Design a protein around this ligand. Structure first.
Ligand code: MG
Ligand code: MG
Length: 55
RNA sequence: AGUUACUAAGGGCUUAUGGUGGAUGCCUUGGCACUAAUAGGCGAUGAAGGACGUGUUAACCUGCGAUAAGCUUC
């Protein structure tokens, strides 16, 4: 499902996605280390989407 | 003058009960010996075996490898 949508995307847009998700993942981990992450599942969702984009 | 019981500090015997202990009996996600087939290898495209790390999850075990408790396709 999601893999089909990313396949529709071009390569340059995909690398923009990966750098943006890397930044967001860093922010989520820092907020968790400060006890300010209400949604603790977005870390896992970010990592899976990151892994899928890498595939 | 004569023959005399009671005593139980404690102990002995019988029976009953309580406590420590895990013998006997019943059972087992475990072992042993084989039968009928399959197969008889992995590695410089990095092996067998380990260290480290990975959780929204204290440690340990298991899974996994910076795509890290999982990624794609049929
Ligand atoms: Mg007495
Ligand atoms: Mg007595």
């Amino acid at each position: 499902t999601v893999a089909k949508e990313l396949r529709q995307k071009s390569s340059e847009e995909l690398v923009k996605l990966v750098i943006k998700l890397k930044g967001e993942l860093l922010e989520y981990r820092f907020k968790l280390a400060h006890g300010e992450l209400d949604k603790p599942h977005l870390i896992n969702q970010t990592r899976r989407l990151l892994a899928t984009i890498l595939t």
